Amino acid sequence: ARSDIEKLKEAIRDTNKAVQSVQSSIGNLIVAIKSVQDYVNKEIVPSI
Amino acid sequence: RSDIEKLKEAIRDTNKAVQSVQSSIGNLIVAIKSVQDYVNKEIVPS
Amino acid sequence: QARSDIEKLKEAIRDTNKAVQSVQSSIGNLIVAIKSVQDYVNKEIVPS
Amino acid sequence: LDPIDISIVLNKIKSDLEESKEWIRRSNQKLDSI
Amino acid sequence: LDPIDISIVLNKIKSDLEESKEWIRRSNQKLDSI
Amino acid sequence: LDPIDISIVLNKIKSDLEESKEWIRRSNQKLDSI
């Protein structure tokens, strides 16, 4: 039906937003790891 | 309708793939938190 | 028309699946990055 | 050395993760309607 | 200091990731049968 | 001690993430066309 097609379209849109939210997560995980590398190189390495 | 049913099944599987990824991201947070806590409670006292 | 809307949905899902596979690749490499931080701490900071 | 604190970025990731979970619930709700 | 050991968490992440790959394989299989 | 540098692998994560964004762009475009 046309209703079932519209529903499947709505479902895939919601699924795509879920993936966009996970993409945002990955972007911030890169930043968190980079901040750990920075802290190590800017503070622990010289102390030792 | 048989194709509508298969598309529904496909999106259902994709959604489960995304739930599995959500669980991986959940544990990546735990992993990074664990590195922070080890630096602070084991290296930084030194 | 019906098989065209059906064919567009099918391709939208194929695209979404490839988006998820690229996220899977990024998570694979995040594991590597985090393990590298673990390995560097245990070979350069914990002996040192 | 002053302690590392990445709690702010980790909170952002947790927030994005929660938002992702709701969109998946919404997708499955729509499929439940078929 | 004892050394850092996050193999347990890394193993969990790997398992979730492998299970994700299989769900995508199943989705694509369904799509191929349309 | 030699600094820690994970820029190579971080660049690989970035690249996968930019590809992911393009597939989602393409998925949305297809849905817009229905």
Side-chain angles (χ1 to χ4, degrees), chain F residues 17-34:
Chain F
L17 181 57
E18 292 302 296
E19 164 168 11
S20 190
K21 293 189 199 152
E22 171 69 3
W23 289 115
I24 289 299
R25 188 188 70 72
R26 296 191 187 172
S27 185
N28 284 327
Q29 150 75 43
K30 283 317 201 148
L31 296 174
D32 285 357
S33 85
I34 277 155

Side-chain angles (χ1 to χ4, degrees), chain C residues 5-6 8 10-13 15-17 19 21 23-24 26 30-31 36 38 40-44 46-47:
Chain C
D5 285 356
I6 285 194
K8 298 187 174 128
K10 169 167 135 147
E11 273 309 310
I13 306 171
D15 289 345
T16 306
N17 286 352
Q21 290 185 306
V23 162
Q24 290 169 351
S26 92
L30 279 156
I31 294 165
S36 300
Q38 155 160 278
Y40 174 96
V41 151
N42 291 339
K43 174 172 104 214
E44 295 277 286
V46 179

